[PDB]
Every structure is written in C-alpha cells, then in structure tokens.
Amino acid sequence: GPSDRQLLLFYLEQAEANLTTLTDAVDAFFTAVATNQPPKIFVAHSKFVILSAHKLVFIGDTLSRQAKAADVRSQVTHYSNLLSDLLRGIVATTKAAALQYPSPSAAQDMVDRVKELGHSTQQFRRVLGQLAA
C-alpha cells in the first residue's frame, strides 16, 4: 500500500543514518574492551551504545504504530522487542563486568551482547529495505 511504502522508505533512510552513529559507538566500545579499559571507560561506552541503538528501537516503535499492513506491524514490532531485550541484556552484563572487574569472562559476556545487538540492528535495517520493496 502507498502510505506504508512511503513510511517504510522514509524510516529506512532514518535507520541508515542512525546505524552510522551506532556503528561508531559499537566500534568505540569494542576498542575500549580490546585495550583493557577499566569500568569508568567501558561503562560510559556501554551507555553510548544503548543510547544510539535506542534510536532504532524508537523508529521501530513509531513505524509499528502507524503501519497498516499486518506483516509490517509484526516484523517491526519483533525487532523493536528484540532490540529492547538486548539493551536490557547490555545493561545487565555491563553492570556485572563492572562489579566483577577485572573478569575476562564477565567482559566477554558483555562483548557478546553488544555483538548480538550489532547483528540484530543490521538485520532490522535489512528487513526494512525488504519491506519497502
């Protein structure tokens, strides 16, 4: 439908822009962990990842509320829920990596949630492009 297609193309463009900020924040986060930075540093970078990814959750929320097509609503609500779940996972594992610092396993858990977030957000964007086509 016309209104859905226009909505999707528009928010695909916004998603692509926000994905840039997220990639920079995730990269910076990985670099912090790879140079063995302490909690005052990697906890800050965690917050940057969360804030920038939350922009994509919000796009999903906005899109899902206004899309007419059942399959569009379904897919975008899935990714909004999935990304929201992963953000809580990042808050949880970051706190645990700080509380147990220095712990290589705690840090790898945190790193894994952030990696999964990176993958899932890229996948969200891919699906928007597919829906818009």
């Binding site: 906890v43 965690s46 917050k47 969360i50 804030l51 939350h54 959750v57 919000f58 999903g60 929320d61 909004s80 929201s84 953000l87 809580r88 808050v91 970051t94 706190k95």
Partner: peptide
Amino acid sequence: MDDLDALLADLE
C-alpha cells in the same frame, strides 16, 4: 520499548 533515561540511569 523502555524509557532511555531509565536505562542510562541504571548505569549511572
């Protein structure tokens, strides 16, 4: 979707 201010607050 959660409130962003609340997620950040829990790391602060």
